[PDB]
Write a protein that binds this ligand. Structure first.
Ligand SMILES: NC(=O)c1cccnc1
Length: 167
């Protein structure tokens, strides 16, 4: 049993809810919250800007030190950093950004990072401001992630379309 409440069950391991991942994080304090990161860990807007704002910019400060030491992530890659006030850990995952012309086939590689964690609170990768089709992102999630994932969909209209269209 875990603390996640009000989710619709899509599969054995994937759950979904219309909610802001920042607010969900503040309530649950999950072991892992996933950030919709870019390779530079520049948390300017969407899931990343909102998560970073909720940490009072401490996520950005930590991220800048990570990049100064390690250099940029790969598209499809990830790193584990602090969850600050939101979670124990933040898994920063880089889905492909369609608005930069990145290979959508990298979305499966992105979701494979989730399999290193038994339970996660996450957004739909490459969805939101990353430009991918969220229906596609949910399908890749279900077909890739084997660990237990609690998806927070910020947009109510989109949430209802993801559920209604789910095969
Ligand atoms: N609060 C926000 O702006 C936001 C954007 C995308 C997802 N969740 C939250």
């Amino acid at each position: 049993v875990n603390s996640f409440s009000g989710y619709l069950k899509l599969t054995d391991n994937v759950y979904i809810k219309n909610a802001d991942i920042v607010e969900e994080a503040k309530k649950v304090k999950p072991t892992v919250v996933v950030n919709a990161a870019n390779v530079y860990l520049k948390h300017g807007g969407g899931v990343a800007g909102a998560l970073n704002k909720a940490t009072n910019n401490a996520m950005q400060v930590e991220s800048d030190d990570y990049i100064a030491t390690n250099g940029p992530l790969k598209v499809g890659g990830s790193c584990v950093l602090s969850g600050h006030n939101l979670a124990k850990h933040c898994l920063h995952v880089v889905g492909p950004n369609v608005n930069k012309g990145e290979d959508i086939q990298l979305l499966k590689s992105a979701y494979e990072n989730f399999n290193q964690h038994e339970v996660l609170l996450a957004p739909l990768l490459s969805a939101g401001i990353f430009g991918a089709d969220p229906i596609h992102s949910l399908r890749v999630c279900v077909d890739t992630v084997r660990t237990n994932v609690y998806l927070a969909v910020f947009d109510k209209n989109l949430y209802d379309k993801l559920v209604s269209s789910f095969l």
